[PDB]
Design a binder for this molecule. Structure first.
Ligand code: 14O
Ligand code: 14O
Ligand code: CL
Ligand code: CL
Ligand code: CL
Ligand code: CL
Ligand code: CL
Ligand code: CL
Lengths: 485, 485
């Protein structure tokens, strides 16, 4: 048996755009993401799947059924976000004493009168509905992490088709400090409205994906799909200071912990001669960002308005990345990690998911202990899961990664919970509905939820607070011989 | 939801030779089967795997742990056998007024003095141990079906190496009416000793396999592996009258129901022009045997000493057999049913097990309703399961076959329980330990039992007496794209 601290919580994470829509009256047509996935040219290009989020799993209407099943599964923590677009579907007045040309945003003043004026423009129907959802959540005894931002922006801040086309005269998302300013005020406003229900806050989810896929990895179908190293850097600079200004904003109205959730990989050497390549990749993908919002270090200078703006770190982990040293520096290798064939085996002989992602639970121990030793900030595993409609690999994936969290705690790392991605199947961005990450399988015609066997395994873990003796054999690699390869 | 009658019981079946040995002091070295699987020539030929049953799962010593897990899983019925060899490890005196040359055995007299004399030769340590096992079983509220015979014979009745070599001067198993006579007395003796613990009896398990694989399908590694159509028929004739004489024997000491357990396939037409081939195959594999022990019809004559010797039918079902009409008659086709590649797909595109057996749950409905319409005797599904160490297919296999029993009941068939093969992994005859049929995975080094996710699924079925809404999606074919093919 592998037992966890009495205070450790098992639960799940979920995103609004991916799970809310699907029931009558639930559609949110007012985001950059909604425009992006409906765009005829994006569909013709195959940048998006043609599946549409308004045919989704229906959490907006059916949240009591989601929460019923989570409670029956023994879950004790959830991380959800509010959709900015639902709260402010129409534009806010452009800020007066605000200079859009100033590169740096070092303060965004929050006060009671500003909050009461913002309240005039908020959608009270959406606010009340979210209160009902979150009250129902809390009434099941679930600890609540509220995340402010999980990729879609109001269209009045970002028209992604205009930017895709190379037109930068309109609302340009994270390329504009207007978005930085409004995100800070949005985050303060939500904490002001919901602090009585929230246990901890996250400002954002996977900001590195926003900048990396939106402006470099443009085949991914992440908006606005405008290929530019320069603008990727500008977007990440703005998202960093937006995190800091939202941290300060929330702290002006709340005493509760404020963290951030990040897309992590475990960087692994192709050969024993590649350890410096690993360090370089960790610098280029992880430490540059966290040194900025924890130590204030940015490109070198120290900004005192960035330093110390983090209480905890959310680790989102799915697989590794294998790197080797080059003359110029380092490169990642296809055939491992997230660059494998779907439903196959990696070059290392490890099974791959429906998404082509390699089975590599030891990477989660690596990431947790690396963060702990560098910053000594406590952590949640805020995402971990697998695309696996058939449920062949998920029982092993679940138990093996939970075991690696147990290992990390035994080594001294302060890890306070494990949140699986996800409770139920949902809309997986440019891939649509075909990638199924749920413990629960969704029938999108009826919106009914079904328990995959891994959900029964998870109930055993969560209700016992342990990997029990009876399921310890699942701490192993899914047998590869019976799988496609 | 698919609900079952309140009296319907879910449980499991298990065999002594396959599961008992593995703990200190549990070895039974005195069967034809033990000699057969240790034989150097059989091992060199690859007729047997080289795995040895004395390294097995250890039910003889660890039965309380088996039963603990079955009780936790909600199971309410078990079918087990006593091993003849354990009860009579040394030979009995040859019967005096018994003519070994008489082809027909129409009566085997049982009386109290005969039973008390038999008792003098019985192993009291084994008898007491079985009583302890069966008492523990009954103390969990499990209904108990006791089967008398599940293939191994005492070596003093069958030396299979001598017969393999073409020497018929020694103890020749089912080729000898001595075995018929002694089986009837053995069955009466066991019922006399255990009737207070038994709810229903079966005389034997899969008699058609004994005759078919022992004397025709000789590549299978089933003893004595002597290829002869003539002797296959002689063995089946003797096993039929042995069933009848054991039926009468048990009924001389007990009022409880006595049935038989049979190896079934669902015979399916390759094309719509092949329905007569199906009927012929059903005649040649199923009806000839049951017409003999129910209607007394044998080759045509009616024997009044065979007629009416059956109260219930145990259906053992794993997959189908596809047949087509030939000029001479009919033939079975490779690439379907039990003649597929392992961990692949059949010619029909259906997934195959670790044993090469095709996924075909509708066959179970076919077999149950065919038996019911012909004989109107009530039934148990006494075996159903899959070789699947990884547990990829078993959740679907379990739910889909249980659903087909629900269908059969809805159509009028009197089916009173479903017994999965098996609770735990065990020694699978000539294949050794590599074919894993358990809901529970066995570590053969430690003898520890682990719950595969399908065991958690089975607990949901058994504790609710139903396929619940939450697992209804498992009534479907395992997705083939992610599996080996
Ligand atoms: F299809 C997609 C992909 C990435 C995204 N980020 C925000 C909305 C959205 C939609
Ligand atoms: F390996 C095997 C195969 C079939 C059998 N039948 C009885 C014992 C035995 C052993
Ligand atoms: Cl990372
Ligand atoms: Cl630090
Ligand atoms: Cl669907
Ligand atoms: Cl049959
Ligand atoms: Cl009849
Ligand atoms: Cl083992």
């Amino acid at each position: 048996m592998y037992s966890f601290p009495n205070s450790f919580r098992f639960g799940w994470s979920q995103a609004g755009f991916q799970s809310e829509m699907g029931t009558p009256g639930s559609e949110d047509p007012n985001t950059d993401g909604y425009k992006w996935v409906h765009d005829p040219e994006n569909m013709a290009a195959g940048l998006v799947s043609g599946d549409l989020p308004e045919n989704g799993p229906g959490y907006w209407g059916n949240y009591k059924t989601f929460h019923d099943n989570a409670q029956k599964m023994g879950l004790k923590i959830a991380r959800l976000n509010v959709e900015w677009s639902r709260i402010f579907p129409n534009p806010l007045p452009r800020p007066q004493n605000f200079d859009e040309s100033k590169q740096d945003v070092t303060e965004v003043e929050i006060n009671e009168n500003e909050l009461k004026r913002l309240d005039e423009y908020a959608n009270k129907d959406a606010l009340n509905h979210y209160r009902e959802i979150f009250k129902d959540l809390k009434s099941r005894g679930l600890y609540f992490i509220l995340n402010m931002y999980h990729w879609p922006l109001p269209l009045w801040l970002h028209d992604p088709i205009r930017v895709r086309r190379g037109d930068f005269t309109g609302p340009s998302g994270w390329l504009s400090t207007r978005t930085v300013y409004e995100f800070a005020r949005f985050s303060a406003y939500i904490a002001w409205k919901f602090d009585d229900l929230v246990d901890e806050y996250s400002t954002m989810n996977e900001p590195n994906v926003v900048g990396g896929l939106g402006y470099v990895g443009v085949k991914s179908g992440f908006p606005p799909g405008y290929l530019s190293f320069e603008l990727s850097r500008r977007a990440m600079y703005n998202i960093i200071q937006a995190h800091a200004r939202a941290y300060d904003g929330i702290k002006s109205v709340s005493k509760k912990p404020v963290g951030i959730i990040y897309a992590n990989s475990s960087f692994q050497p192709l050969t024993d001669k590649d350890m410096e390549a690993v360090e370089m990749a960790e610098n280029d993908n992880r430490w540059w960002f966290f040194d900025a919002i924890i130590r204030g270090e940015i490109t070198k200078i120290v900004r005192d308005d960035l330093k110390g703006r983090l209480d905890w770190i959310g680790v989102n982990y799915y697989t590794r990345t294998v790197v080797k040293r080059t003359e110029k520096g380092y490169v990642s290798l296809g055939g491992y990690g997230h660059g494998c064939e779907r439903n196959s085996v990696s070059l290392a002989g490890l099974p791959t998911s429906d998404f082509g992602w390699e089975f590599f639970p030891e990477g989660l121990y690596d990431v947790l202990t690396k963060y702990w030793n560098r910053y000594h900030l406590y952590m949640y595993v805020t995402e971990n899961g697998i695309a696996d409609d058939a449920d062949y690999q998920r029982p092993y994936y679940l138990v093996s990664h939970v075991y690696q969290v147990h290992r990390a705690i035994n080594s001294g790392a302060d890890v306070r919970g494990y949140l699986h991605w996800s409770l139920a199947d949902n809309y997986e961005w440019a891939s649509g509905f075909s990638m199924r990450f749920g413990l629960l399988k969704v029938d999108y015609n009826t919106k009914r939820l079904y328990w995959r066997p891994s959900a029964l395994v998870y109930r055993e873990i969560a209700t016992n607070g342990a990997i029990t003796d009876e399921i310890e054999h699942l701490n192993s690699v899914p047998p590869v011989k019976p799988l496609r390869h």
